Amino acid sequence: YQPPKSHCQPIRGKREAILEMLLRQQICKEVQAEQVESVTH
Amino acid sequence: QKMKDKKESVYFSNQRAPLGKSHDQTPGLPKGLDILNTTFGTAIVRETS
Amino acid sequence: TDWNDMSKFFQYGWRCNTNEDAYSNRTLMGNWNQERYDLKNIVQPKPLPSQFGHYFETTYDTSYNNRRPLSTHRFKREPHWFPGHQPELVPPPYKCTEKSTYMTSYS
Amino acid sequence: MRECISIHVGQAGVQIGNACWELYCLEHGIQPDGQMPDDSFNTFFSETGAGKHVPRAVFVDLEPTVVDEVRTGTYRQLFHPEQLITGKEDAANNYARGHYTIGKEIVDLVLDRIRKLADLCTGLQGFLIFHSFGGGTGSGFASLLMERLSVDYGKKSKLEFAIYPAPQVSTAVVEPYNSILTTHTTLEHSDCAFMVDNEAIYDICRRNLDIERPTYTNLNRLIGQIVSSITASLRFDGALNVDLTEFQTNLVPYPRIHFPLATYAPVISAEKAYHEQLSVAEITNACFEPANQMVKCDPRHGKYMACCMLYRGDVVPKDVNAAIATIKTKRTIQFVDWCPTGFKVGINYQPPTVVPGGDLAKVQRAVCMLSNTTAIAEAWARLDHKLDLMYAKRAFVHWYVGEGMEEGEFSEAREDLAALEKDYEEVGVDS
Amino acid sequence: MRECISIHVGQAGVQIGNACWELYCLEHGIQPDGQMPDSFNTFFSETGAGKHVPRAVFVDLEPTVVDEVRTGTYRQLFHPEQLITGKEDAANNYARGHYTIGKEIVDLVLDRIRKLADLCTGLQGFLIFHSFGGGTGSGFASLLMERLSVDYGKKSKLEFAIYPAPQVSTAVVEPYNSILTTHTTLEHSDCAFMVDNEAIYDICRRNLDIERPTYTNLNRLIGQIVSSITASLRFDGALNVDLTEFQTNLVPYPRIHFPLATYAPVISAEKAYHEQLSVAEITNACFEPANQMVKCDPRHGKYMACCMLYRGDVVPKDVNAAIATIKTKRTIQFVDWCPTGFKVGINYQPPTVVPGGDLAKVQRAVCMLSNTTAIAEAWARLDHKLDLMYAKRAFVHWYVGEGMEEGEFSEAREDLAALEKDYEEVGV
Amino acid sequence: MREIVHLQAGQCGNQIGAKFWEVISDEHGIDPTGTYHGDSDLQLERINVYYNEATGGKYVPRAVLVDLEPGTMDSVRSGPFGQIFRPDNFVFGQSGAGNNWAKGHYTEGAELVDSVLDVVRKEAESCDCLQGFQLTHSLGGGTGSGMGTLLISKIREEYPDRIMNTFSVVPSPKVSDTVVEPYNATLSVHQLVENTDETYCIDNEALYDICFRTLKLTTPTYGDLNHLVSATMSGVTTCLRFPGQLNADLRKLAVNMVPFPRLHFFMPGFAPLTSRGSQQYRALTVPELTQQMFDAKNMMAACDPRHGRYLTVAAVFRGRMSMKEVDEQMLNVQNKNSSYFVEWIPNNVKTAVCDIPPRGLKMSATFIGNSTAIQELFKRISEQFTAMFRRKAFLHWYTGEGMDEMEFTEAESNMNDLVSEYQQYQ
Amino acid sequence: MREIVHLQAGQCGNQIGAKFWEVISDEHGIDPTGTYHGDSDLQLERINVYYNEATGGKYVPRAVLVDLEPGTMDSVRSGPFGQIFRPDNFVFGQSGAGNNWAKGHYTEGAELVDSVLDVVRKEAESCDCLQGFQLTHSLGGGTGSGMGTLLISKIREEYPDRIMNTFSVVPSPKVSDTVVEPYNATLSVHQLVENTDETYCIDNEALYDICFRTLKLTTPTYGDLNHLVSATMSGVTTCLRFPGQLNADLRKLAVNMVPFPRLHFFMPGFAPLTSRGSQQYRALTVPELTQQMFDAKNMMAACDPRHGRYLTVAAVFRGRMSMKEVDEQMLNVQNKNSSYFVEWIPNNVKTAVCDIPPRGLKMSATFIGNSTAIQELFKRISEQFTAMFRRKAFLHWYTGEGMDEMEFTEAESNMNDLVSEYQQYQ
Ligand SMILES: Nc1nc2c(ncn2[C@@H]2O[C@H](COP(=O)(O)OP(=O)(O)OP(=O)(O)O)[C@@H](O)[C@H]2O)c(=O)[nH]1
Ligand SMILES: Nc1nc2c(ncn2[C@@H]2O[C@H](COP(=O)(O)OP(=O)(O)OP(=O)(O)O)[C@@H](O)[C@H]2O)c(=O)[nH]1
Ligand SMILES: Nc1nc2c(ncn2[C@@H]2O[C@H](COP(=O)(O)OP(=O)(O)O)[C@@H](O)[C@H]2O)c(=O)[nH]1
């Protein structure tokens, strides 16, 4: 029972990950954003 | 290299025996005849109805 | 086909003792014709013949097949009604709703 | 609205079907994807609400690797996938394999497809069968398919387009067995059998065209040409139309004698046609030249009994009749005494369509000969003499018996075809 | 949520729980410190700032096995009061851990269970891991279950108990404790999955390529099985199966709640990736007697109910087809009053591979819970083991000298005989 | 124009009706948010049948989302069409019924009925002229079989003069999910007979055989079958929303379909089902639709009408078709198999033609059929009930929730009386 | 859909199989790591026959690798292409059959035949449609000649309708490697003539002759002979795994090829073999492949066809070519040689033109011949047996194992019956 060795290899490109984050900022910031006179005058 | 190999052997029996074609008929047929659009044989002029 | 109640689980469909449907595509086992008709498979691009391909060409290829690069385009999504419906083929890009018999006849 | 349904069985069926359907898609304005960028296409094509045309043909072959390239090629979007019927393993040059185990497995599928193709047509006139005599499934599966169609439909006409075994050259060893076993069950079921071979078309391609070492496509294109010229009187207007029913009943005198030959007249390249005069009197005696016929036999020893002219292009009748009146004058071409003047003539107003990459030249006149001839009896004599050589030593019999067959059916087939020899030599004697 | 409080008692319990909580930390994103670099609420509870502590309790009467785990890799993960350690062990004596050394530490464990349960909102069950051949996991576990069924009533509890192996064994007084705690656990357990150690030794030597294994190589298998049971309480699936679904479709009678556990794909990395591991060819590996985890054979008895738990990319069509072709086998026998006899569950999460383990990463997994009358032959062995050795009254003086009267041996033996005659009237 | 209130019970019901609302909004031209993005005026003509009007010109379905398991309310909103449902119409408990009709009907399915009834009474009073109700549920669970039947009983007490519809998912004969399926199935069919007007029997195995032999799909999912069920449910309310030459609502179908008040178990079907490779090659004509609509391997129940006789038959058509060849085809399918129809009736086929087809197809049709072969569905449930009840197996779960042994016997007696009632016409 | 399960027994057959899966994998574009890297999609369209696709896109083969001594099975999991096999198909034995038919049949083959039959059945029942088996082995040594013969006998029992292909290694006439070869040869060919369908004989003397006077090499290795054997053995299943204009599978090459069930001993050939120094002076044409195929020095059987007469001839042509050359060459090879064919078969030869050539060649061919002259090969072994057995030379290691003296005489009688029933057709 040793501290586990997370052999984290990327399954995706760096450019696509940057693009995903870049889309996610704007999409999250907008999805959090969707959610004088009387009648006889 | 295979098309080069075929081109070095054009002065060969490839002249008068290709795989699928017959023989290059351009030296036997005059100039640019447009073989697809050519109706060989005589035709009748259809005068005298 | 339906010889008895247990007639299936041996023919096709209900079957778990063959090597079919474990091969991937471009392998031609079992259902492969209906998979190339799928809309996912149509938009997959076709590579050009790139070296040593003059070995692997047949008489059907040099006699009837037309060798030309094919452009790949997406289809505009349309409603599906039954499973396997592919209305995004056929000519009209947008299928307008039909009109009533009164609207066509009385005008 | 006279329509035809084609049945292509086997490798020889599917390849010939590819050639002839390419020719049909090019004769009309049909692209290989099925779109047409006139109503003459009804005989071979249907219509669909998407502006799409589907051929009226079925392809059947238990060996899958002949229809698989059809499915993978550029003609994929033209054919109906449910009209392309494949199996899982071949018949392997055995009548019994294609007639008794997987012969009966797929019959209820092919007959369903034929029935569905028949409900979508109003005036159906006949069935065209494409199969090989010496194959495994063209001899097995087609020979029981036509016997089932003869009981399912009846008053239609069954015409088969058979690749008869060549005299000297041949592919398989057990070809006489399959041939003699498929000609036993077709004699009392099929109506007529226009048959060709492969050696004679080889000689024609070597001589009349300049092409040495041809492939199967260079023969299948000629086969598609003659098959189109037979049906050319259906979809195109002419002076004398010949229907599908009529060349079922003026070539065959007796139902045991329904084996004519085949011949295409202006088989020629661009070079030799470019010098040649192509008059009607010059191409109609090319049909009677023994060099130009798709069955190797010498008709001078034989006796002609019936003939069928099929003309297309710019052809006026009296060139034809002043040409046949010349035919009757020479002593070499000699008919049979019980038949008087026995020609059937048909004129069409459409010249043949050349295929790009093809070898024939676009010409103005064409003649398709279908002639019953007594000289075809020599081919059957050689074939059953070959079986009598093979059957004496019990060669390859064990491959047949252990496959649902019976030793007595070899005898019943050979005693059937020994009567064809004494049939053909009694219709040639002086009456 | 869909939470579950785990109770580990004994050396076997804590050594199983080490591997179990390693797999629980690694299945989610939980580090050994307890930090994430919300489906973890089943096993972990968030604190205010950033830490996820487990919902378990680790009980033992000796400190040479709990002080192992608070001086190791996961010493910061566990709450340092959830690790309850005693001063003196029961020393392979049911009487000691049930009446003498256990009557006065059980109040502390009850308080810790209550303090874990006030943080609880949607409590679903209790997972109890121990062994039948000891003094702590046999006596103190029995006392804990007796008190828990009174303090909580209808709340379900599950049992993962190491049954004594038929041929090999560790202790000598094993049959006495393993019959006494079986008699006690009979009325206070809703389900009890028996596991042997000889059968998992055979599985490790035969299915995996790893031979001369350790207790770790079995505890990883047990942790994988217990992860597949509670997989539907955390992850989405086509067919969710909860713990109320568990005993409703498994036990037909309240006295018959002893199912057999099986894990189908058990293959090392050298042989795993040359196979076409579809659900079809691995769902009939559950019925192989070599893969069974109790050293018995289900072909000696009648199948009564089977629960199939699935992981990964399982399509319901293919499991349905394979199951309906399982019934067309004449080797497997089902009881007559269960015409269908199957319960299925499909989870979308693939099984989580542990680095340094023996298993290989796969896309599909099956956990099988088959209730069979073949477990009656497991009672015959230790029944004969007791009455062959109780007649000379061997090893009795520690039991009768430590808070235990003499009638309990006869009462437990009578209860086991009634169980053996209970499993024989079902098969007819 | 006739309003319809929709009801969903259980996980199977909740995943069937989500796809049903998807296809309903899909043929009415409604985006998942709720706005109208259509092309014609007919799509917005009778949208009050299934929708309300909210602020901003958006539409909300008239549906109630009921299940005991709280986990499946997440799977509806997070689906492809989850935004359109109103969050106040989601009702849910703590724990599932656990495949137990007993606690789905008495213990934990009888204190949440008050909230569901409040929602329905709240919502069915917001419409002009309510036609009736629909229910999608399963017979082999605990929520849709227990709570659903109690819901049907309470609504039938509250609203006796309306119609009640049910698209039941009956236990399949050979493939199965639960070991306790006959216990819930018998005791739900016993409650269905006196409380419903129209019942549809859906078998999962029949849907799989459809997806195998007709659509030629090699690996269908559960949405792959929910799509077929949803296509069928939309085709029986077509004349309620689109105009036509011969309209027919649900009450008129019920009047001309079931002859005696207990024989209301039908077998549904859908006509234009083709493979992917043969839908560019097959022309949708009425002789093509009616040939495979009366084919015995089309209907979504595991009952073969060649074993039985057709009491009455319904066929609701959509599209621009002739009114002579539909009746010609109905007499064509009624006269030649003279032994498959009851003789003491004049006319069995019911023909209704709606003008507007589904957007993209040419023509479509829906099948509804009363057959005496529906009794075979109940023989396999009764046999598995009596094979298990005689050994008192799996019984303490039902007994311990507050039920007696005589309810099982009396429910079995009602099942056998239902079976013997259908045998008079065979 | 016509797949083959491949069997390897003995060290010789195991090395031959290793070279076989070298050649098939570099023909179908399989990496040593198991993936695909080929240059066309026509190679992968018929990967059925030899490869199983596991999870992850790895194409493991249908190889059954069995041997009685592990000293060669570590070398068989070879460098380049030994890791593509699945590890569960390796079936080992402890004590190798040290040149003993009896040890390979009775006391060391029998306990391993039951552990190899289960994996053979597991692979065979997991096929869509099995076509047959190939068993590469030898008749000289112990484990091949005994254990593979026992495997053939057991397989022919449960699959009587399949194809039993064997690629045998008959002992050479000139220089042999062991001495007790005649005993194993005759007791293996006893059960080879009755349980198989097609048998190919491969001598090492003829292979050395080929590697000397055709390829012009001085000191060839065993891998060269194995590559020639694998090249001809890959050439008979081409038309069933690559499209062409005239196709022929293994049953095709049996129906046309054996006239009687017990005359099925073939003798193969390989046409386009040329040296390095003569590489650029020889045009690749049909009249050259046809000339080389019928050359007596081009063949891998010790017997030359000048002594006998061909019963039937097979010739699987490969590459893009024309039919007329094949036809006229086959006609002229019979007309110009009229004294070397049987008169009671009209067409002895059989042609089949595939379209895909081997790797790097443009046009190729594969000869399969059934000559009468193969009776001399068995005559030599019968002569050696009659010279050896009469002094009871090495019967000590056979009779002390579980065999009698009577078993040898039946094998000798079957040899004499095979030889005597070949001279009638001369
Ligand atoms: N003229 C011509 N003959 C062909 C063609 N294709 C095949 N053949 C003939 O077919 C014979 C071989 O038998 P087939 O009919 O092809 O075999 P089969 O019955 O289809 O059974 P399979 O082996 O599965 O193909 C050869 O002798 C050829 O003469 C073709 O395209 N044109
Ligand atoms: N499978 C498995 N079994 C274990 C493990 N640890 C202990 N056991 C079993 O536990 C049995 C005896 O229990 P103990 O290890 O003595 O623990 P206990 O129940 O607390 O008993 P005491 O230590 O005397 O208090 C032995 O027969 C072992 O087979 C383990 O890590 N894995
Ligand atoms: N057609 C269809 N059937 C389903 C679906 N989901 C579940 N089922 C069926 O529903 C049955 C079980 O329903 P269940 O989960 O018990 O409903 P519950 O009462 O809410 O628990 C199973 O036999 C499944 O076959 C679905 O999406 N479509």
Ligand SMILES: Nc1nc2c(ncn2[C@@H]2O[C@H](COP(=O)(O)OP(=O)(O)O)[C@@H](O)[C@H]2O)c(=O)[nH]1
């Ligand atoms: N062509 C060839 N022959 C071999 C090879 N290995 C062994 N042999 C031959 O096989 C004979 C020995 O028999 P063998 O099959 O190896 O014995 P067994 O495997 O124990 O049955 C020798 O005469 C060798 O000539 C090889 O790689 N290639």
Ligand SMILES: [Mg+2]
């Ligand atoms: Mg074929």
Ligand SMILES: [Mg+2]
């Ligand atoms: Mg301890």
